[PDB]
């Protein structure tokens, strides 16, 4: 009875899937080769696609459906004052989303019908290089959302530090050149053109954005949050809406004492007006948006 077999190996795969991130092996290979003998009981979700498999990503250059959004830069209290000055005189009171900056590779997941299609890098943030093969081997990327909504949705994938720390290990010892930072490990093991080789690495995915909200009920930046979660993808709840920039200030002040402390590195912190509205009310300067800002450390 393969229908009902396929089926409960796609349901005990995707729960380890949405667990953790070696029964897990044996299911694993029980449906890839019932994907052999009968390919057409592969679904363009199956699991099976965790293990990497025979297809080398393209990195072919592909524009994102929509641009990614160019930060401008904060680098103190000051910086920070006058950006939320500059709102508060244009469309008035306003709250924040405060979330920490995580140092990975930046990603766009392309979903159509709720299916995973497409995975790029950020590249120039017009257009970025095709690795949706070894981005499925990412257990936190869910291969179908619990909508069927077409958007892309923004992440950032990183190695975390303990494992980062036990490659380099390997590397040093067979002298070849170590990974400057974690960072650097979780980029080069996303662009390996064999993506069974990434499938062996250690990655995660947090998502901070999607391109378009229209099919979102969300109406603000951490209502948004909160419904990517429950579509099925993993987001960082360190963060935090706050009323004003001094609750800016202090979630600022809070976090850049802990950047060293997590299991990921961080580079700063990103601020957006919440309210999905007044983000648009704000409108973009030099192809910026006036809404959003990241405080370097």
């Known amino acids: 009875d393969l229908s009902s077999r396929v089926n409960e190996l796609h349901d005990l795969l995707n729960q380890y899937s949405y667990e953790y991130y070696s029964e897990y092996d044996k299911l694993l290979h029980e449906l890839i080769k019932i994907e052999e003998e009968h390919p057409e009981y592969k679904t363009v979700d199956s699991p099976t696609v965790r293990v990497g498999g025979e297809a080398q990503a393209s990195f072919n250059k592909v524009n994102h459906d929509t641009p990614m ?9 000051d910086d920070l004052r006058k950006f939320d000055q500059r709102i508060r005189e244009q469309i008035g009171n306003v709250e924040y989303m405060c979330e920490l900056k995580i140092d990975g590779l930046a990603v766009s997941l392309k979903y159509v019908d709720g299916y995973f299609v497409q995975g790029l890098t950020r590249g120039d943030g017009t257009t970025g290089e095709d690795i ?14 619990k909508e069927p909504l077409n958007v892309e949705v923004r992440g950032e994938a990183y190695m975390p530090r303990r494992s980062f720390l036990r490659l380099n290990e390997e590397k040093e010892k067979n002298d070849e050149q170590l990974f400057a930072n974690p960072r650097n490990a979780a980029a080069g093991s996303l662009r390996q053109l064999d993506s069974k080789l990434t499938a062996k690495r250690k990655l995660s995915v947090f998502i901070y954005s999607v391109n378009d909200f229209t099919d979102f009920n969300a109406r603000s930046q951490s209502e948004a949050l909160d419904e990517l979660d429950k579509l099925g993808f993993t987001t960082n709840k360190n963060r935090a809406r706050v009323n004003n920039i001094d609750g800016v200030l202090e979630y600022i002040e809070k976090w850049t004492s802990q950047r060293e402390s997590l299991p990921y590195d961080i580079d700063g912190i990103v601020i957006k007006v919440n309210d999905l509205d007044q983000q648009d009310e704000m409108g973009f300067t030099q192809k910026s948006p006036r809404w959003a800002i990241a405080y370097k450390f």
């Open 132 to 145: 949706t093969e070894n981005l499925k081997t990412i257990h936190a990327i869910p291969l179908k959302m």
């Open 69 to 77: 959004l160019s930060l401008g830069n904060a680098f103190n209290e």
